Design a protein around this ligand. Structure first.
Ligand SMILES: Cc1cc2nc3c(=O)[nH]c(=O)nc-3n(C[C@H](O)[C@H](O)[C@H](O)COP(=O)(O)OP(=O)(O)OC[C@H]3O[C@@H](n4cnc5c(N)ncnc54)[C@H](O)[C@@H]3O)c2cc1C
Ligand SMILES: Cc1cc2nc3c(=O)[nH]c(=O)nc-3n(C[C@H](O)[C@H](O)[C@H](O)COP(=O)(O)OP(=O)(O)OC[C@H]3O[C@@H](n4cnc5c(N)ncnc54)[C@H](O)[C@@H]3O)c2cc1C
Ligand SMILES: Cc1cc2nc3c(=O)[nH]c(=O)nc-3n(C[C@H](O)[C@H](O)[C@H](O)COP(=O)(O)OP(=O)(O)OC[C@H]3O[C@@H](n4cnc5c(N)ncnc54)[C@H](O)[C@@H]3O)c2cc1C
Lengths: 649, 649, 298
């Protein structure tokens, strides 16, 4: 009963697309099991303002990500590098996966991030068509309400970019080699050409723009809707309430509220998978040809290990009765970003400061994401690729936001009350984040929301009684995240001083200065950078360098004092992935090593995170997997003018 | 397949006692459920000192209650009173349940709690026999190693109590009505017998002692061992490897790797239970007579909601098929305590302060804490019952530990070194916490670590359009935790200010100061308390009092800033319970209201949180359930000299 | 009752390997009797620091070798050549034999020690594969923390070795003939090639190195474990708590806490062996084809 040539686990960001383009482009019987259910008529999801809690009950006013009925609750172990706290990250449960609860921003990643870090047969020129297909299928829209702050910021970054171009340094964070001598920045003219950060040819690596492309749409009424995988690939036009396909998709048979705990094996090939229905009773599903797993970043290692594939020593220590294959790499090598935050306050006359921040309110067409640029490398960064003098990378993503987005305790401590209406927010984050972790299960019975999740982000360095030059490379490798965070702070400071001069030039007689990071510290950091140079981070370890000069010890105190911001004055970005990268757990065909008929086709099978937000990465993976499993480039050849018909239901 | 006359859910503290004492007096089939595995040869759990991290790997040094392979990770919903933090409370996963991961501390809770806060048939004069049986079964041992600060604290508190009892105040925190106006402090003379806090007749409610009691056990070699509930009642001296007992224990069988799904009903009566093993095969165990669900104060309500007992509307919306009985109050009123930490500094010459703080190291007979007393409510607290003037209660719990117990971020912000010996922690645990919460399920497919659990601790008040005379009771009732915490702060300050002169008299030429809570602020708190008398609490809200005196503004600011510390400079102890309290889901005979033959014997059935640790209360509930289901009072009159026996192998 | 084609006495350093590779590579019924029992979940054994007494009770702080519950107590006669004293030597009792209480160091022996002193059919070229099999099965690991003293010592021995080579004497203690004129000493360079004293071809007879190969391993947690015969050849994957093999090793039936005092004979062939169980009562074991004894040196 309930057989299937291809069995798909989870209707995540790639599961829905895989099921759709697999049922349509073939004639086999396909069955999909998803833990969540459709939310097509849920006002909290469809309305973009539901992210801010416009439909919450009065006595249960919690966020959608913190609701265990919408997402997995992945509580993590205490963090040695984050002052011994236990933050909780979530994965959206339901059709579309984590695209039901995100902030609806799309980035493609770039050209170099796929050209260098990815293995052969996987570069940008092979996934360009899949990326374009995904983007046109989503069909995003830019921001509609334009503000005066954005033009001033654009001209400021333009001035900084032209100064850096005239400088002659090898690489900086406003240098786009593929463009040329002309700075890669948008124009402040009201009739400027809208510059895109997702160009089809990948010519824009680091560049300043005016807006991103939200995953929203405007309806005939005037209401805005949320566009994501669920309402783009698996609407009512294809699957009914009985979970059956119609038309040429009749081979698909999707089952909702179905979580699968284990894949049954015959020793080296899969024969069936079992799930538990809403009755609380178990069920059996028989697999014919292959098994597809789309369980997301944090939870494909668990389903792989619990099913019998993984480190046999630790699995035996846990108590796994049935063992299949032994790799010491299952679940290791996952990556995630981190977003330090800064707050800038404007001082002046009330009218001028009220007019300066015009057109900033949270709107469904932007969700507060005005955005500035995807910045690159710092001039003082020690940890840079060897071939940096040949290509330009992506390291930072500068985005502007209204209000003061900071944890409440830090808001009270710093005094930045949201009642103040003369301040805004800009965020610089790291997309090539260094620190790494691991996931291990604790019980081989059922997939639980809390496995052993060790993630230490900003660790320190303990000097030893060894020669300094012998140990310095180790310290440089270890202290990368703090270096990146402080370089981001310096970049924000340069952008801010350019903002001040440009705003004074543009007729607004106001001044913008940093207040949140205790500007004394930031100004001292800038002075120390200028007076020291490439060896600025040597004083991160005070007794190792042993300068013992008042300037040197004061800089050591400043560096130790400023390390608290990157650790506590931010919130962790939920872009985890790449826990089963190609070569570690799967080959270049996304098939498991040593196994015969199991395939994994989500973000968990990514070699390295992209140079941007990873919405399109998962779907793209699925798209590629569609033609890898079918055997012909059916999906990649389809013309650009073919999008699934969007049904609101 | 299996058959069982009486089924007990959860091999925990009360569950194991229930199972052993039920198979002891009869020969009917008994089945005990437990999903983990054996831990009889694990040094971390067998050795009592392994609780503090004796054998933890250096790379993964975490507490045993923070390890997913040892316990469930029941993260709760954000707390609106502490900047939205989500503390995580754990339930043990193994033989003995939560008795495998605790401190083994034994406290009864006095007699007034069961004199006024428990229903008829649950009074102290009826449960004292069960409490004594539990205490003599555990067989604790008193502390042996002695420091030289306990006598100083006892003498200072003796002076304070003498002054207070001679003052003639109506009620205070150092007066006991069951002994007399003579102060009840342990004599510092070396020829004084100790006054235990667990007297069989409950003579002492507020009592000053020297140490606590702990459920460790002694070996022939000299090594100390842990004899937990699953080790005292379910060890190999009574039950074999396979499960079949011999002789009078032949009616007991324990299952392994069994995690339940739901109890199948036949309309109103329990007919069977089910669970899933490692392989993933469900086994139907039919129940003949009764089902006792005592799987914990966090997951018994969960399995009851899956059973179909709770809110019909919510269960129907979520997707629960079978509805058995509707009870809106199921899993409501969850109760737990709270404890803020503080740091005291010692001043003087290094040698004298070093010898002053000597012999203060954790061992299997102190568990780090020294312990002083358990005081009552203060002289200015407006939150008291009517019976306060006729009988004393147990409101606060004071302990002293070595080192510093304080969050690492708080350590950095306060700038107090952990390596320094001269700082010790003076914590005032509150055992009469005001607020309560409830529990709901998220997804009816499989058991999950994180259900919906709500708990708000520091709910602040906001002015509303109403006269102050008709508003003040609301502010009084809303702000109870803050008043209790600040009065505890004042109690600790008084204790230390007396202990200064007491230590000066004792010989040590030292001075002790209250550093971490900003002694300036605590001194201001004491001065304002003494100045404003019974009307001080009106100043928490500055707009309502309507006094524009600069001293009033200063006092209001001092009250406001001092509220920050209890949110972050504290920790929420894992003594949660009272979710299915007597009179809401169960009645005096523990039969669940609505069903036929179902009973709850966990800690969630407590009618009120006792003034202390909660293992003894749960063991008492299980012991009472033994005789309630047996029908004859065998355990109520069992001789004290008849005790179980333990076997290591 | 309790018959067996091959009867093995004691699960010593060779008994466990013999039982494993005999039950797996044949189809006869094999039964093993061992005086000790498994210590797979004993922190004193698994933890390498248990050798220094990190888990001893306060009132019984004695070494693991001096504990009669872990090893035989072979007290010796007074020594005329050692000033009339009676030192006591021990043999580890249990799975793996004396490998439960040793200091976890592995040496192969060399080429000449087997080439000269051993009889025909037993030289190094006949036992090379067995030695390599044993070494790869144990899979030892070198030292991880390097010290400054070792480099200074290495260069000192290098200077002494080159002086002795230039001397021209017949044989000395830094002269490796199989190497040549270049001294057989490791290099003090931080990026030196790790020289091995257990080379597969036996080219290193006398040579200076940087570390041996401990019988330990590093776990995913970070904890170190003791690697020896018991946890290398007779784990839970092959024998259960009932002492029965599983899979292709089902012919094996091991009995723990079984000491055999005598082998019964029919005049020139063995017919059975008898042991005493933990009850303190005797038992009879019948031998079918041969008897194997692995009771150790003493
Ligand atoms: C607050 C927030 C904001 C974000 N903003 C952005 C943004 O602006 N831009 C961006 O690019 N990304 C953003 N993200 C991240 C983005 O939502 C996802 O990380 C991205 O879709 C990649 O993850 P995924 O979809 O592959 O994982 P998912 O597909 O979401 O992984 C979980 C899925 O697997 C299924 N599943 C898992 N285990 C099982 C099982 N055992 N049985 C059955 N089904 C199972 C679940 O049902 C679910 O469908 C944001 C995330 C969060 C939390
Ligand atoms: C960290 C910590 C410290 C503590 N310290 C103290 C102290 O110092 N003093 C004190 O008096 N008390 C202390 N306690 C409390 C003590 O543990 C009490 O026993 C507790 O309050 C009540 O335990 P219980 O009997 O309800 O446990 P139970 O809930 O009965 O034990 C849990 C059992 O239920 C089983 N189980 C749960 N869910 C399922 C399922 N779905 N399927 C199958 N089996 C299941 C588990 O396997 C386990 O065997 C502490 C508790 C904790 C967590
Ligand atoms: C402190 C110490 C450190 C050491 N360090 C090293 C080192 O670094 N390197 C190294 O190579 N060696 C070392 N050794 C020596 C090594 O442990 C052994 O000598 C080596 O394993 C060779 O002995 P064996 O294993 O064959 O003897 P064993 O096999 O240990 O001999 C005793 C075995 O025979 C069994 N047995 C004996 N009589 C009976 C009987 N009547 N009935 C049943 N069973 C019986 C016992 O149960 C036990 O299994 C060390 C020894 C000690 C004591």
């Amino acid at each position: 009963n309930l057989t299937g040539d291809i069995v798909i686990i989870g209707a995540g960001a790639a599961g829905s697309l895989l099921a759709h383009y697999l049922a349509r482009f073939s004639n086999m019987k396909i069955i999909l099991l998803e833990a969540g259910h459709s939310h097509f008529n849920d006002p909290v999801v469809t309305d973009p303002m539901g992210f801010f809690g416009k439909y919450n009950p009065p006595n249960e006013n919690i966020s959608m990500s913190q609701n265990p009925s919408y997402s997995w609750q992945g509580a993590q172990e205490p963090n040695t590098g984050a002052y011994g706290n236990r933050p909780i990250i979530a994965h959206g449960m339901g059709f579309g996966g984590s695209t039901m609860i995100n902030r609806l921003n799309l980035v493609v990643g770039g050209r170099t991030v796929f050209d260098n870090d990815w293995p052969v047969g996987w570069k940008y020129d092979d996934v360009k068509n899949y990326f374009r297909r995904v983007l046109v299928d989503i069909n995003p829209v830019r921001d509609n309400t334009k503000a005066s702050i954005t033009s001033v910021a654009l001209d400021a970054l333009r001035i900084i970019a032209e100064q850096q171009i005239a400088s002659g340094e090898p690489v900086d964070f406003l240098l786009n080699k593929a463009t040329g001598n002309v700075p890669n920045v948008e124009k402040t003219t009201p009739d400027a050409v809208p510059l895109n950060l997702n160009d089809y040819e990948g010519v824009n690596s680091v560049v300043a723009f005016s807006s991103f492309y939200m995953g929203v749409n405007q309806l005939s009424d005037g209401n805005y809707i949320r566009k994501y995988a669920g309402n783009t690939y698996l609407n009512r036009n294809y699957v009914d309430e009985n979970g059956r396909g119609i038309g040429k998709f009749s081979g698909l048979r999707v089952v909702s509220d179905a979580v699968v705990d284990r894949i049954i094996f015959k020793g080296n090939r899969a024969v069936g998978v079992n799930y538990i229905d809403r009755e609380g009773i178990m069920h059996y599903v028989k697999v014919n040809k292959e098994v597809v797993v789309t369980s997301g970043a944090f939870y494909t290692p668990t389903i792989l290990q619990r099913s019998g594939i993984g480190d046999f020593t630790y699995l035996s220590s846990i108590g796994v009765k049935n063992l299949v294959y032994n790799n010491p790499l299952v679940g290791t090598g996952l990556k995630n970003h981190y977003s330090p935050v800064t707050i800038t306050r404007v001082h002046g006359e009330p009218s001028e400061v009220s007019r300066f921040l015009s057109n900033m309110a949270a709107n469904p067409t932007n969700m507060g994401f005005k955005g500035l640029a995807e910045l690159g490398f710092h001039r003082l960064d020690p940890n840079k690729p060897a071939n940096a003098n040949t290509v330009t990378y992506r390291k930072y993503q500068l985005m502007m936001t209204a209000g003061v987005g900071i944890p409440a305790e830090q808001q009270y401590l710093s005094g930045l009350s949201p009642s103040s209406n003369n301040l805004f927010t800009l965020i610089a984050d790291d997309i090539r984040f260094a620190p790494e972790g691991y996931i291990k299960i604790g019980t081989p019975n059922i997939p639980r929301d809390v496995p052993k999740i060790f993630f230490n982000t900003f660790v320190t360095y303990t000097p030893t009684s060894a020669p300094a030059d012998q140990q310095w490379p180790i310290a440089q490798k270890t202290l990368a995240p703090l270096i990146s965070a402080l370089l981001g702070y310096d970049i924000i400071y340069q952008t801010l001083i350019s903002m001040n001069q440009t705003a004074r030039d543009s007729g607004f007689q106001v001044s913008l200065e940093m207040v949140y990071p205790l500007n004394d510290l930031i100004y001292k950091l800038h002075n120390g950078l200028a007076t020291y140079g490439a060896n600025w981070w040597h004083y991160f370890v005070p007794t190792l360098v042993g300068d013992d000069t008042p300037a040197g010890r004061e800089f050591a105190d400043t560096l130790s004092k400023l390390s608290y911001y990157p650790r506590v004055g931010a919130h962790l970005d939920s872009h985890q992935g790449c826990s089963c990268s190609i070569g570690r757990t799967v080959d270049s065909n996304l098939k498991v090593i040593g196994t015969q008929n199991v395939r994994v086709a989500d973000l968990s099978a990514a070699a390295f995170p992209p140079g941007g937000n990873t919405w399109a990465t998962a779907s793209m993976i699925g798209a590629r997997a569609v033609d890898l499993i079918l055997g012909f480039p059916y999906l990649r050849d389809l013309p650009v003018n073919d999008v699934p018909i969007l049904n609101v239901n």
